[PDB]
């Protein structure tokens, strides 16, 4: 059966300025099947609240799905998206580069 | 609004 | 301008794991307005756009009636597929459906649309005349004479010309203020170098609606179409897409460059240059 592996892109909702109030995001998209583990690391770390957008998919019928938890930055904290799917043969971590 | 007739494959 | 309403529904099966998995949503151009999912607490359709929170009861209580029915066609059809298939009752397996309406810049019908798929794959869809149908596989030609038999497309084809578009009209009026909105892009560029003869020169477009924009690099004027990074547009999460264009620039080169941003929010498509 159809397999396609999640793009995935990390990243604020707002320009990061440390010490204000944000968003991060991971954003997952194109896979197939729908099943996907989406964690967000906070220095390593599973951060607790992360709330994720309601399935939907694309004219190709690929998935895809934003994940995301409310932060503040600042200039020490590091953050990243872990993703885990069929198509991954092991967990794939992206990190929070806060110019992409 | 969703459509309200129902079809099965 | 042109608008669409599109539903969207994915059905997952989970054997030994209880009912398959249902999740139905809707949108308005870009902007989702409702949801309903198999798992939640609530069992209801509900609202995920300002605008159609003041629909009231009637309105809720129907589109819930509604969208269970579909659920529970949506099971039958898993068990079914399974069935044309031959396939084990172990596996999961996924259904999808899309189904919706244009108008074009005069807010009258353009297009209707109806497909599904199964497993990730194209299994039938109504074709643009709304009249018959495109099968994909030997499984999905009995679904199609099915259909046929039936009279399927003549419902279908009622729906997408009249209640889809008079409810998409609807909406447009009823959430003005977020649908016939634009939002232009906020622009800027970033710079940072990659050795001592190269720097990446990175064109953002920030905080836009709809999503629908074309970034692109030119070196004195020649697009830079395959050498340029650009990576898919998305959600920042409060209703606005982002996206990036990046190109490597070499050294005392960065005056070469310009980023085009095309976008229907914008007065004048812009010309953006590291200087």
């Known amino acids: ?100 | 609004l969703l459509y309200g007739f129902v079809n099965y494959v | 301008g042109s608008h669409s309403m599109r539903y969207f529904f994915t059905s997952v099966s989970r054997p030994g794991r209880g009912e398959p998995r249902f999740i139905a949503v809707g949108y308005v151009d870009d902007t989702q307005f409702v949801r309903f999912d198999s798992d939640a607490a609530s069992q209801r359709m509900e609202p995920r756009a300002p605008w159609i929170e003041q629909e009231g009861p009637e309105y809720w209580d129907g589109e819930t009636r509604k969208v269970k029915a579909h659920s529970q066609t949506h099971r039958v059809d898993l068990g079914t597929l399974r069935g044309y298939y031959n396939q084990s009752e172990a596996g999961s397996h996924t259904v999808q459906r899309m189904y919706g309406c244009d108008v074009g810049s005069d807010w009258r019908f353009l297009r209707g649309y109806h497909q599904y798929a199964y497993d990730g794959k194209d299994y039938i869809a109504l074709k643009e005349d709304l009249r018959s149908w495109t099968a994909a596989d030997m499984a999905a030609q009995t679904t199609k004479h099915k259909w046929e038999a039936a009279h399927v497309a003549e419902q279908l084809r009622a729906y997408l010309e009249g209640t889809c578009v008079e409810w998409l009209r609807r909406y447009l009026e009823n959430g003005k203020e977020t649908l016939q909105r634009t939002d232009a892009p906020k622009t800027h560029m970033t710079h940072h170098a990659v050795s001592d003869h190269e720097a990446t020169l990175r064109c953002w477009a920030l905080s836009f609606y709809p999503a629908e924009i074309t970034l692109t690099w030119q070196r004195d004027g020649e697009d830079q179409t395959q050498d340029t990074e650009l990576v898919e547009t998305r959600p920042a999460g409060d209703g606005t897409f982002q996206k990036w264009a990046a190109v490597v620039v070499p050294s005392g080169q960065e005056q070469r460059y310009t980023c085009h941003v095309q976008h229907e929010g914008l007065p004048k498509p812009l010309t953006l240059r590291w200087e």
Request: with cysteine.
């Open chain 1, 1 to 100: 059966m159809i397999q396609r592996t999640p793009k995935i892109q990390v990243y604020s909702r707002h320009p990061a300025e440390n010490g204000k109030s944000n968003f991060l995001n991971c954003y997952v998209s194109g896979f197939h099947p729908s099943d996907i583990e989406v964690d967000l690391l906070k220095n390593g770390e599973r951060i607790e609240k992360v709330e994720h957008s309601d399935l939907s998919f694309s004219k190709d019928w690929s998935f895809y799905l934003l994940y995301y938890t409310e932060f503040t930055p600042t200039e020490k904290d590091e953050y990243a998206c872990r993703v885990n799917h069929v198509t991954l043969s092991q967990p794939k971590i992206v990190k929070w580069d806060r110019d992409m």
